[PDB]
Amino acid sequence: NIQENVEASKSRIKDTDFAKETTQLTKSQILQQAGTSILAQAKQLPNSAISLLQ
Amino acid sequence: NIQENVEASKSRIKDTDFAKETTQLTKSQILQQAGTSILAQAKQLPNSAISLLQ
The DSSP secondary structure of B4-50, one letter per residue, reads: HHHHHHHHHHTS--HHHHHHHHHHHHHHHHHHHHHHHHHHHHHHHHH
Q: Whole-angstrom Cα distance, residue A54 to residue A25?
A: 45
For residue A22, count other CB atoms closer than 10 A to its CB. 14
Instruction: Please report the residues numbered 7 through 26 in chain B whose beta carbons come closer than 8 angstroms to any beta carbon of chain A.
Output: none
Distances (CA, A) of B20 to A4, A41, B25, B44: 33, 82, 9, 37
CB pairs under 8 A between A and B: 7
DSSP string, chain A: -HHHHHHHHHHHHHS--HHHHHHHHHHHHHHHHHHHHHHHHHHHHHHHHHHHH-
Resolution (angstroms) equals 3.4
Contacts of B50 in chain A (CB under 8 A): 18, 22
* Experimental method reported for this structure: cryo-EM
Among A51, A24, A37, A13, smallest CA distance to B53 is for A24
Among A1, A24, A19, smallest CA distance to B46 is for A19
